[PDB]
Design a protein around this ligand. Structure first.
Ligand SMILES: CNc1cc(N2CCC[C@@](O)(CNC(=O)c3ccc(CN4CCC(C)(C)CC4)cc3)C2)ncn1
Lengths: 199, 241
């Protein structure tokens, strides 16, 4: 279980019920503001099966600030926090047509009643350097791990550099399938005997 | 490197380590030269018929006193949502709504849509704690910022960040820098600040709030500042001779 795991797939079509339940879900969707997903495709994502009790981290920008709130609620979450990442250069200087944008937003949703999470350890501002285009700061994984140490986590629309211990990463630019958790391996084989993920 | 870990280790917020042409001052001078006299009216906004404020405004800054501001009479989002802000907004106009850090980030967006605006910017007031390295039950993280949402209605420089030190307990003032950002947009000269205070009164603004100690507002005098030939100035151009 513990080492990084991933599935190259089209998240619209993967049967995510084979993955089990997660303490934390993070998504960095290609909002329709690379290839994108339509608003309806985002709404229809089977996020509700991924968790019983825990937190969702949902990166948003532009009009997805609103559309992401719609999806969050549709999927069964209440938005209880909002992280902002202040983007700096290597010298800690800060790097929408009315104002220049110094930050990215990450909505934080809760589902059910999570118990045993370390709420309040971190604050809701990240100061970190822009790495490359569309690369989120690695600090978010540390905040999430301190909030929920040792638990199962899943990232949607991640790239190879996003794979992390305790996480399963889904995205269509990953290299193949790499699954180590025996429960997931078993359910994947049953559901996908020939290893193909289509409709 | 990892300022989040550092905050966990030391209590210094990550924004404490953010660090840090020459023409954005003739603009400031033009703004200053075009500003109307400061005007202000003490009014219990809940009991006040908002329609007595005329004419319709180009910019509305709305700063309702939320309960979360008094951690250690407040307005609920129920109260705020029931304001008839669309009745005093010009068909082309802007709003800046201080929403706090909790449920107002959602309910303030409901308000903007109810009043007929679309959100076009999300301005974050990030509070440092350099001088001093309690959670809402629903909070997952320590809340160290407030949001001021900018909304636009009708058809159609700075950064969306204000960084200052967290005020002392009991201080509800928002950073005056919000006025600079607003005025730098050059949106027109009829500017309303609802729930302002004696301390926020400012040239170029009509300030309306329950705690003001004095009033000088006269609707006819105020309207006279914008009568022809000055009906459509941006607030950033020279006065008409
Ligand atoms: C069609 N169905 C799919 C699509 C799919 N994608 C579609 C191709 C790209 C994909 O491979 C990897 N994601 C990205 O590159 C990507 C690009 C931009 C953003 C926006 N964000 C950037 C990071 C931020 C924190 C700065 C804030 C803003 C997020 C992710 C996933 N994955 C599975 N199924």
């Amino acid at each position: 279980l513990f080492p990084p795991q991933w599935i190259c797939c089209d998240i619209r079509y993967l049967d995510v019920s084979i993955l089990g339940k997660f303490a934390v879900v993070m998504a960095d969707p290609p909002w329709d503001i690379y290839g994108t997903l339509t608003d309806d495709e985002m709404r229809r994502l089977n996020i509700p099966v991924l968790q019983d009790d825990g937190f969702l981290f949902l990166w948003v920008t532009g009009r997805a600030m609103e559309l992401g709130r719609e999806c969050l609620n549709l999927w069964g979450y209440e938005r209880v926090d909002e992280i902002i990442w202040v983007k700096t250069n290597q010298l800690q200087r800060i790097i929408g047509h009315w104002l220049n944008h110094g930050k990215e937003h990450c909505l934080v949703g809760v589902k059910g009643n999570p118990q045993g999470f370390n709420q309040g350890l971190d604050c809701d501002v990240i100061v970190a350097e822009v790495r490359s285009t569309s690369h989120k700061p690695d600090e978010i994984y540390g905040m999430i791990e301190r909030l929920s140490p040792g638990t199962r986590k899943i990232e949607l629309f991640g790239r190879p550099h996003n794979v992390q211990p305790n996480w399963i990463t889904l995205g269509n630019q990953l290299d193949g399938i790499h699954l180590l958790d025996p429960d997931v391996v078993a359910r994947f084989k049953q559901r996908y005997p020939d290893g193909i993920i289509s409709k | 490197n990892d300022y989040c870990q550092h905050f966990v280790d030391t209590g210094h917020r990550p924004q404490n380590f953010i660090r840090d042409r020459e023409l954005i001052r003739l603009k400031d001078e033009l703004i200053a030269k075009s500003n109307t006299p400061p005007m202000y009216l003490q009014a219990d906004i809940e009991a006040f018929d908002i329609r007595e404020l005329t004419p319709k405004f180009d910019v509305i800054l709305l700063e309702p006193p939320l309960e979360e501001y008094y951690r250690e009479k407040c307005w609920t989002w129920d109260d705020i949502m029931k304001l008839e802000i669309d009745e005093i907004a010009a068909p082309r106009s802007f709003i800046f709504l201080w929403c706090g850090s909790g449920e107002g980030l959602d309910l303030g967006r409901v308000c903007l849509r109810k009043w007929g605006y679309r959100r076009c910017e999300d301005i974050c007031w990030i509070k440092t704690n350099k001088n001093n390295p309690t959670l809402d039950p629903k909070a997952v993280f320590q809340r160290t910022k407030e949001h001021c949402l900018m909304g636009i209605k009708g058809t159609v420089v700075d950064i969306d960040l204000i960084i200052t030190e967290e005020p002392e307990i009991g201080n509800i003032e928002k950073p005056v820098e919000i006025f600079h950002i607003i005025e730098h947009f050059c949106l027109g000269r009829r500017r309303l600040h609802l729930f302002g205070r004696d301390s926020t009164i400012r040239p170029g603004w009509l300030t309306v709030g329950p705690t003001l100690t004095n009033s000088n507002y006269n609707a006819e005098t105020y309207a006279s500042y914008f009568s022809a030939p000055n009906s459509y100035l941006t607030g950033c151009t020279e006065e008409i001779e």
